[model samples]
Target chain A: LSGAVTALILVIASVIIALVVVGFAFGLFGAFTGQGTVAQVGTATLSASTLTLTVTLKNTGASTQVTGVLINGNSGSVSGMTTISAGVNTYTITISIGSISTTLRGLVGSTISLTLILSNGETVTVSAIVTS
Target chain B: LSGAVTALILVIASVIIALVVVGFAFGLFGAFTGQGTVAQVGTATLSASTLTLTVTLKNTGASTQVTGVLINGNSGSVSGMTTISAGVNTYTITISIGSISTTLRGLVGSTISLTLILSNGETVTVSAIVTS
Candidate 1:
């Protein structure tokens, strides 16, 4: 009878510990999928002052953790994260395309897509028409 | 005595069932977070044969379930799902943009962004400097 009682207690303890670990995993997994998205591309412009492209992106979820931008599947530099504040959802970013700076001129009659890579490893894609 | 033993059994069973349910939730949540990414954009072209933009996209994960393509934030039609094979990761698709036919001319000197919408509600963006 004593052995049977101990077995039951061990089983219950194991179950509680396993469930708590799973709870945390579910939370992280859900949070990753729930990444904020690009609310809109307010505008995209080829800089008049410099040889760069500037784009305005609006966030639709929590704070934006943007890390990188991809132009035509190539890596590009972003302005910084401080551009958007806590209560603010709109942020403007400038992209530096080296060789593509001259190539972009050839796309005058086409659509352009910019990708925002978040810190959580998720990504958001927004589109704009390049009117240089 | 009978009442005491019955209560213990019920408690053990409840804890076991709850943990199992939590386990499944973690699995689904993790799966959603593991969405495949666009490995690369092989080529993008404005076809002379039809009023469509043809693009080649390579997937790096499981099967691809492409739903829509957006040009300049406007919805465009995708060819279909069969364009990608099971063991094949490279898929070519043609996109139909309605009014952008003339407007795309203005983008000749700019970059065009294409947003790919997947069935799992995730999106991928690829850019191209239109030569056309």
Candidate 2:
């Protein structure tokens, strides 16, 4: 009788352990679907005296988190009208293109879609058309 | 003796159940936070046509997504060679500014700042200083 009891207990434990493992495995798989994310250098519009540089970041994940990111872009723009100015973290690029000088303001617009490309390398540009 | 075996099996079943619950909780939490995502609309800009209509889209999130957006700027320009071709989503009021109807291509050594009010209720002025 003692042997039978032990066998039953052992079987239950094994089954439970297997279920636990499978459950955790499913969880991991879900996590790994990894929530899609993407970043794009907008359609590259002109800001007159400058070109507005907009870098968009988005998440297609199932959940959300308190996120903070630092965006760095190279002046791959064919037009060199890029600059970085921070007003307590508000960035603006003042460009001086062909005798045209203007400050390029990077203002976020819309919901769920956000972007802040403050500095491109070490040299934020002056008023000029981006040529990328 | 049979009862003792039954009792042992019950104990094992209880333990397994507890284990399974705990595992599931952990798995769920892990999956929930394992994936990080964000979206942003960096900034809005202008796409011009003979200085007629200028509109653009943007992002302001921290993560990333496929990100397809359309930006419509309600025309609020105060000065220009051409007036508001399209004001808002469905309005276009054109008024030749300052009676300045000079050919844009040959309007050299001249310049001015034309304030274009975006559809988002924000105003961005385009400063043009033509040099011959």
Q: Work out the TM-score per prediction.
A: 0.43, 0.28
Tens-digit per-residue lDDT, A1-132, candidate 2: 999888887767766665576568657656655543332223323343244333322333332321222212222223232322221111233322332223223332322222333332122122212322
Top candidate (lDDT):
1
lDDT of 1: 0.58
What are the per-residue Cα lDDT tens digits for candidate 2 across B8-127?
A: 655765676578778988998876553332211122222232334223223221222221222233222323322222212222223233334334445444453444333222234334
lDDT of 1 by residue, A1-132 (tens): 444555665677567658877997899898866665554546565442343455565655566555556666446556544334334344545666565556666677467776666544346676766665
Fraction of native contacts under 8 Å reproduced by each candidate? 0.00, 0.00
Residues B19-48, model 1: lDDT tens digits: 566577667657765566554333345433
Report every candidate's CA lDDT. Answer: 0.58, 0.35
> What DockQ would you assign to candidate 2?
0.05
Off by over 4 Å in 1: A1-132, B39-43, B46-49, B56-58, B80-90
